[PDB]
Design a protein around this ligand. Structure first.
Ligand SMILES: CC(=O)c1nc(NC(=O)[C@H]2CNCCN2)sc1-c1cc(O)cc(O)c1
Length: 130
């Protein structure tokens, strides 16, 4: 309905604002663009489902997220992809894993603090009816 497209538009506005706040954080610069095969050739090997914050913005604009859970699944994908590509003890890996955990925890904490629980529930129930 008009009432439901309003809800989904508000969700999109919210998710764009969260994602922008993640994307401008210096810690998360490695997660802002897709991995370049030129700069990192063996990534396309290990990571079957690449994800990054620019792709999140495009999916928002494509109406691909109808719920916050849907969005958080892709945030979790950015994080788990980074843990898988960086399993070793050496400091390059440990630094990426730390930022990846911080990206995930930051996204969850912004949503917990600023997203109304009844709004996310409305989003869920509209989606379940489709
Ligand atoms: C996002 C990600 O998971 C990622 N992981 C890396 N790991 C390493 O470089 C590890 C590999 N093991 C040996 C020690 N170095 S680099 C990197 C990345 C970094 C950027 O500046 C841009 C970008 O698009 C991706």
């Amino acid at each position: 309905s008009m009432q439901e497209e309003d809800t989904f538009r508000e969700l999109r506005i919210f998710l764009r604002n969260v994602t922008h706040r993640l994307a401008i954080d210096k810690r998360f610069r490695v997660f802002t663009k897709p991995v370049d095969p030129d700069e990192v050739p063996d990534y396309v090997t290990v990571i079957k489902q690449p994800m990054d914050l620019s792709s999140v913005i495009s999916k928002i604009d494509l109406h691909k997220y109808l719920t916050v859970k849907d969005y958080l699944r892709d945030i979790d994908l950015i994080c788990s992809n980074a843990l898988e590509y960086n399993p070793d003890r050496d400091p390059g890996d440990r630094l990426i894993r730390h930022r990846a955990c911080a990206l995930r925890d930051t996204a969850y904490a912004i949503i917990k603090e600023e997203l109304d629980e009844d709004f996310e529930q409305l989003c869920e129930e509209i989606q379940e009816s489709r």
